[PDB]
Structure formats: structure tokens, C-alpha cells
């Protein structure tokens, strides 16, 4: 029922060979819809999601992102005395809930630690420590950031979320069934059973092991839900059992693309 728009912005003094020092990745729900980086200097849609974008919209995104790049440059070249490389990060966006109400998000991190956040509902800032507190008091007193980001989060982000939901609706709604593989390896006297779910979309999934129809959570390991390059996902679960009992174990997979949960054996 609810939908989400999120931007992930990274500035780096040491991104590594051939890598851009500033990057933006935009997400609509569980899907990358566009990106920007300091080498191309262009904000560009993911065409498999947004196949018919107009240049006017992305001209605007490019100019806003280039402004973000300069701000991250400005900050990274101005860190207080508070060796090594440094990073700036920002995550912002909005939720539209099922009844149309809105939630905004806006948080910064320095060297990977919480730094400053902005809450649009109360128009207040939160500083994560006394150094951030200097920035918060300046931003509050200056009196302009709060109004700008109320607008950005509660109006611009919402408008763009609805646009990407409509323009990208074919990609967002197409369910992709997981291809499931179970296999076992006999290490010493232990038989390790693996259950991998390949290539599913949307992202949410569950994988559980069962023996004699009873779930077996105590000794299960899960690898997590991780991305494929094509916008589908991968997930895994493993369990260790005696080689004699390898036939009694079932991996149960639940996914929106599966009318009923699927059961798989070795």
C-alpha cells in the first residue's frame, strides 16, 4: 500500500582508482530508478525501469545533483579538526502511505557516523554530537534550510515519487518467480544443506527449513537478500544435518510471485 522514494548520496576524498568522488543512487521502493556521479556529471534514468523519460525532467535532476556535488565538496574541504580519508553521506526522501499521508527523511553522516538530521513534521534538527550541534544552531538561526527542505521533502519528493510510480509501473509490478536450488555437501560427518533462491522480484522473500513438517530455525543460517545486476534479488539459507537425514529436510520459500509457498528438497 505504501511507497518510498530514497536518495543515497556519497562524497569521498578517496574513492579509489577510476572511481567518482561523488555518487547519487535513487530508489523507488526496491528498485534503482536513476543515478548521478561526478565523472559523467549527468543524472540518468535506469531505462529498464523508466523507458520513456523526457529530457526536461532529467535536465532538472542533473542541475540539482551538481549542486549537491558542490556542497559535498564544500563540506569535505572544511571538516573541523574534530589522518586518513573522509566521507560525507546523505539519505533523504519520502513515503506516501496508503491513505496519502506523507513522511519525510533527511539525515547526514560524516565518516560513517550519524551527524545531523532534519525532521520536517516538527521542522526541527537533531545533532548527533556537540560538533554537529554547531551546524544545527547555524541552520536554525539562519532560518532557511527548514523551509527549503519542507518543500523538497513534502512537495517535490512526493511529486517525483508519484511520477516514477506511474512512468515505471510496468517494471514495478512485474513479478519474477525465484529459481530455487537445494544441494548438499558432506563435510566430515555433517551434511550441509543449502537453499538458494535466484532472480526474484519484488525484493521481499522468506526461506525456512523444515523437517517432518516442523520448522527448524535453531541451527539455520541465512545469507541475506542481495542484489543481482538486473534488478532481481538473491537469497539463501543453510542447515547442517546428519547424512542419514538429508531426505527429511525441506526448504520453504514464500514470495509474492508464488500463489502458495513452495517446498524444495535436495
Amino acid at each position: 500500500g505504501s511507497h518510498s522514494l530514497r536518495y543515497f548520496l556519497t562524497g569521498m576524498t578517496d574513492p579509489g582508482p577510476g572511481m567518482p568522488r561523488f555518487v547519487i543512487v535513487g530508489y523507488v521502493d526496491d528498485k534503482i530508478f536513476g543515478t548521478y556521479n561526478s565523472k559523467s556529471r549527468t543524472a540518468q534514468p535506469i531505462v529498464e525501469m523508466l523507458p520513456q523519460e523526457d529530457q526536461e525532467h532529467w535536465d532538472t535532476q542533473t542541475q540539482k545533483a551538481q549542486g549537491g556535488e558542490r556542497d559535498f565538496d564544500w563540506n569535505l574541504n572544511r571538516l573541523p579538526e574534530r589522518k586518513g580519508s573522509h566521507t560525507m553521506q546523505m539519505m533523504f526522501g519520502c513515503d506516501i502511505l496508503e491513505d496519502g499521508s506523507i513522511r519525510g527523511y533527511d539525515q547526514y553522516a560524516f565518516d560513517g557516523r550519524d551527524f545531523l538530521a532534519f525532521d520536517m513534521d516538527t521542522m526541527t534538527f537533531t545533532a548527533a554530537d556537540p560538533v554537529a550541534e554547531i551546524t544545527k544552531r547555524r541552520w536554525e538561526t539562519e532560518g532557511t534550510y527548514a523551509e527549503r527542505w519542507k518543500h523538497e521533502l513534502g512537495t517535490v519528493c512526493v511529486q517525483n515519487l508519484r511520477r516514477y510510480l506511474e512512468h515505471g509501473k510496468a517494471a514495478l509490478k512485474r513479478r519474477v518467480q525465484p529459481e530455487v536450488r537445494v544441494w548438499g555437501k558432506e563435510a566430515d560427518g555433517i551434511l550441509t544443506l543449502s537453499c538458494h533462491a535466484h532472480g526474484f522480484y519484488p525484493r521481499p522473500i522468506t526461506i525456512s527449513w523444515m523437517k517432518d513438517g516442523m520448522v527448524r530455525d535453531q541451527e539455520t543460517r541465512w545469507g541475506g537478500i542481495v542484489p543481482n545486476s538486473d534488478g532481481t534479488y538473491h537469497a539463501s539459507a543453510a542447515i547442517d544435518v546428519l547424512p542419514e537425514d538429508g531426505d527429511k529436510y525441506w526448504c520453504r520459500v514464500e514470495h509474492a510471485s508464488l500463489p502458495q509457498p513452495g517446498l524444495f528438497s535436495w
Binding site: 573541523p80 545531523l116 551546524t135 534550510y145
Partner: peptide, 5 residues
């Protein structure tokens, strides 16, 4: 976001 100085 102009955070520092």
C-alpha cells in the same frame, strides 16, 4: 547542505 563554515 552547507554544513561546515
Amino acid at each position: 547542505g552547507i554544513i561546515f563554515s
